[PDB]
Amino acid sequence: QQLMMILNSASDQPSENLISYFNNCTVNPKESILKRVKDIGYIFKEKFAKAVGVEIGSQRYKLGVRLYYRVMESMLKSEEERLSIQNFSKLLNDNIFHMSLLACALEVVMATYSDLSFPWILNVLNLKAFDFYKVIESFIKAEGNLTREMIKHLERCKHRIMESLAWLSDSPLFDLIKQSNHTAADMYLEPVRAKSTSLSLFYKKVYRLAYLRLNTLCERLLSEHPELEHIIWTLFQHTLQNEYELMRDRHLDQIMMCSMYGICKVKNIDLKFKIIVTAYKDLPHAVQETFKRVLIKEEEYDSIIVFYNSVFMQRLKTNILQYASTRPPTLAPIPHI
Numbered sequence: 001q002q003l004m005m006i007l008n009s010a011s012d013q014p015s016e017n018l019i020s021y022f023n024n025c026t027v028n029p030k031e032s033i034l035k036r037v038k039d040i041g042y043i044f045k046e047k048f049a050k051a052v053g054v055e056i057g058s059q060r061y062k063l064g065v066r067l068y069y070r071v072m073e074s075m076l077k078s079e080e081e082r083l084s085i086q087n088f089s090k091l092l093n094d095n096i097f098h099m100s101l102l103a104c105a106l107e108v109v110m111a112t113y114s115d116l117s118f119p120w121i122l123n124v125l126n127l128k129a130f131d132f133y134k135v136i137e138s139f140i141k142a143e144g145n146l147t148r149e150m151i152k153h154l155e156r157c158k159h160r161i162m163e164s165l166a167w168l169s170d171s172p173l174f175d176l177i178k179q180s181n182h183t184a185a186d187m188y189l190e191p192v193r194a195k196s197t198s199l200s201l202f203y204k205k206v207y208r209l210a211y212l213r214l215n216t217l218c219e220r221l222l223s224e225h226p227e228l229e230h231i232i233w234t235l236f237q238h239t240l241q242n243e244y245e246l247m248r249d250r251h252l253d254q255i256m257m258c259s260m261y262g263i264c265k266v267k268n269i270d271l272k273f274k275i276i277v278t279a280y281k282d283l284p285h286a287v288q289e290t291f292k293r294v295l296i297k298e299e300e301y302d303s304i305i306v307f308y309n310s311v312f313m314q315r316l317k318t319n320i321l322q323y324a325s326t327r328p329p330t331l332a333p334i335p336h337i
Contacts, residue, residue: 003067003145004112010066018073021080025089036098037065040125044106047124051116060109067105067143074142075101079185087189097188099127100135104154108146111153118157119165129165130173133158134198138184156285162206163252173202177244203240206252208335210236214256216283221260221276225269231323232263234332235316243315249295250307253280257291257304258312266324273305 014022014030022030041061048057079088091097107121122132136158140151166173176199187198211233218229236259239246247255257276264271277291294307313320322329 001147003143003147006070006145007063007066010070012062012065014069015073018069018076021073021076021088022092024085025092026085027089027093029089029092032093033098036095037068037102040099040102041065044124051120060113061106064102064106064109067108068102071105071139071142072101075138075184078142079183082183083185083189087185090189091185094188096127096131097135097185099125100132100184100188101139103127103132104135104139107157108150108154112150118160122165128172129161129168130171130198130202133161133166133202134187135184159209159285162202162209164250166202167247167249167252169249173199174244174248204335206240207237210240210252210256211335213253213283214260217256217260217276217279220279221271222264225267228263228267228269230331230334231328232260233334234329235259235263235320235323237332238319238329239316243319246312246315251290251294253283253286253290254294254304254307258308261308262312262316262320263323266320273308277304 013034019030022028022033041058044061045054045057048054048060076088076092079091083091103121103125107118110116110121111118119129121127122129136154140146140154146154165171176196179194179196180199182197182201187201190196190198214233214236215229218232222228222232236256239255239259240252257273257280260276261271261273280286280291281288291304293301294304295301296307296311319329
């Protein structure tokens with residue numbers, strides 16, 4: 001609420017201190033920013049009215065712009081001490097950065113006055129999910145006045161990217177994988193020419209997420225053999241690392257479910273899919289469609305079992321059978337607290 005009243009009384013264009021920073025740039029970007037704001041405003045108002053039968057669409061967008069500008073300033077204030085004069089100015093003239101900061105401010109506004117739910121704004125601004133991921137944490141950390149529910153929303157936005165949206169085809173994440181600290185500005189200053197801080201942070205966070213979800217379902221379902229959780233994590237984590245094609249257009253929680261059934265299957269452990277798959281519904285934001293509609297190949301979808309036997313097993317039979325031999329694979333590290 002407080003932030004929402006700083007914005008209503010605030011201004012639709014940059015503070016003077018924010019312009020101080022524009023005056024610290026070699027290529028004064030301010031011209032480019034104002035143009036970006038207006039051209040985006042045009043596309044935003046269209047797609048806005050296009051879905052809800054302007055007046056509201058214009059006012060949503062201006063609050064975002066006030067939030068966009070407030071956070072940029074705060075963000076630039078940390079980045080003074082971190083970036084060279086050259087990197088500072090490259091940031092302020094970087095399209096994908098500014099697109100992502102504004103898209104994140106706008107999502108805040110949209111979801112406060114809340115389907116139009118995320119990722120609508122990323123389809124509005126044609127902004128790749130993986131690009132947007134780079135801004136979220138630094139955004140939360142640059143706006144001390146986000147409410148709890150709202151932080152929860154950005155984090156939910158963040159987690160859906162980690163679990164699916166970054167794994168969509170044509171998503172740049174796959175281009176970054178093939179070639180194989182951590183502020184939003186660091187990740188946007190990455191070039192598009194051939195190690196990626198962006199990929200390293202994403203995979204690191206994904207592993208902590210993916211494991212914590214594994215841990216929950218393993219304690220409920222594998223308390224009879226607490227020995228299986230670390231083995232299942234090994235299959236899961238090996239799969240995310242070296243068989244990353246399996247995640248393409250699929251869901252992190254789908255790979256988690258196959259791994260637990262797979263490991264229990266080669267351990268001759270009686271734990272059927274539906275026994276765990278019913279337990280997955282009891283995860284916080286879980287959906288039934290996650291195990292009811294699973295991609296096989298060329299746009300053909302089916303249950304998770306059809307995915308298990310017809311795609312998952314076909315691709316991992318060589319790895320999975322090592323876990324029951326006299327020379328099982330070495331166990332993968334647990335992601336750090």
